[PDB]
């Protein structure tokens, strides 16, 4: 006369990263190494109209 353990079940997590989501259509990635080429986190632009 016994008792049974009918199953063991675990969810598995998968991911689909940032460059795969379509929210990235809006922004452009960069190195972050050449953030050290600019000084003080600034970038100048001479825009002519």
């Amino acid at each position: 006369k016994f008792e049974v353990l009918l199953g063991v079940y675990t969810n598995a997590i998968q991911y689909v990263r940032f460059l795969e989501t379509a929210l990235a259509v809006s922004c452009v990635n960069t190195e972050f190494k050449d953030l050290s080429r600019m000084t003080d986190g600034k970038i100048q632009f001479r825009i002519s109209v």
Binding site: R37, M38, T39, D40, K42, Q44
Partner: peptide
């Protein structure tokens, strides 16, 4: 502008007379 070189990138270096050490301005 607070600092003369904030928004600008640094490319070259002019050394006085000869390219020896960092003593020259």
């Amino acid at each position: 502008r607070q600092s003369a070189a904030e928004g600008l990138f640094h490319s070259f270096d002019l050394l006085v007379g000869k390219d020896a050490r960092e003593a020259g301005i």
